[PDB]
């Protein structure tokens, strides 16, 4: 469980993310695919993109980035009260996309990397700690919902 102060640090940096959702989304997905290339194999629409420049030019990848950060933003703003938001995401990611928790660890590392790169003055040790805790909570809760659906990834 995060403290109220921890949630405030998470939502303070998230407001900065919301000034440019699409640009954050692009940077996060590109960082994920660069750091952990096996994650790109999960994306039929995107696995054909071969360079960073093709990735940045893809309207499709940019729209996807917005849909990822919009879902994650809605979950974070519930401060842990996220069952109704998390359940459909678990359903699709367990049963259709088949995304293991280790891949959610990879995208969480990418989120932290981009937030630190873009907003270091609003993302110091205590804010990084808080965001790490919020994303650990997200991964714990989605793993439980994965298992309810019969997915052990």
User: Least distance to ligand HEM from the beta carbon of 114, Å?
Assistant: 12
Give the CA angle between residues 96, 136, 84 to the nearest 5°.
55
Tokens of 25: 């989304």
Cα(115)–Cα(120) distance, integer angstroms: 7
Which CB, 10 or 107, lies closer to ligand HEM? 107
Q: Which is nearer to ligand HEM, 93 or 133 (CB)?
A: 93
- To ligand HEM, the closest distance from the beta carbon of 113 in angstroms equals 14
Enumerate the known binding-site residues.
64, 93
CA-to-CA dists, residue 59 to 2, 53, 90, 112, angstroms: 36, 12, 26, 24
Residues lying near ligand HEM in the complex (CB under 6 A) are found at 39, 42-43, 45, 64, 67-68, 71-72, 89, 92-93, 97, 99, 103-104, 107
Judged on CB neighbours under 10 Å (0-12, 13-18, 19+), 131 is buried
Query: Closest residue (Cβ) to ligand HEM?
Result: 92
* 38 neighbors 105 (Cβ within 8 angstroms): no
Q: Give min distance, CB of 143 to ligand HEM, in A.
A: 13
Nearest distance in Å: CB 95, ligand HEM: 10
Q: What are phi and psi of 144, to 5 degrees?
A: -60, -45
- CB nearer to ligand HEM: give 121 or 152: 152
Closest CB to ligand HEM among residues 9, 69: 69
């Amino acid at each position: 469980v995060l403290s109220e102060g921890e949630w405030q640090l998470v939502l303070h940096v998230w407001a900065k993310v919301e000034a440019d959702v699409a640009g954050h989304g692009q940077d996060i997905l590109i960082r994920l695919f660069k750091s952990h290339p096996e994650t790109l194999e999960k994306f039929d629409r995107f696995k054909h993109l071969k360079t960073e420049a093709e990735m940045k030019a893809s309207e499709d990848l940019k729209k996807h980035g917005v849909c990822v950060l919009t879902a994650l933003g809605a979950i974070l703003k519930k401060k842990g009260h996220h069952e109704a938001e998390l359940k459909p995401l678990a359903q699709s990611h367990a049963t259709k996309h088949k995304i293991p928790i280790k891949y959610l660890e990879f995208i969480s590392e990418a989120i932290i990397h981009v937030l630190h790169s873009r907003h270091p003055g609003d993302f110091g040790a205590d804010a990084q700690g808080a965001m790490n805790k919020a994303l650990e909570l997200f991964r714990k809760d989605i793993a439980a919902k994965y298992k309810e659906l019969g997915y052990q990834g």
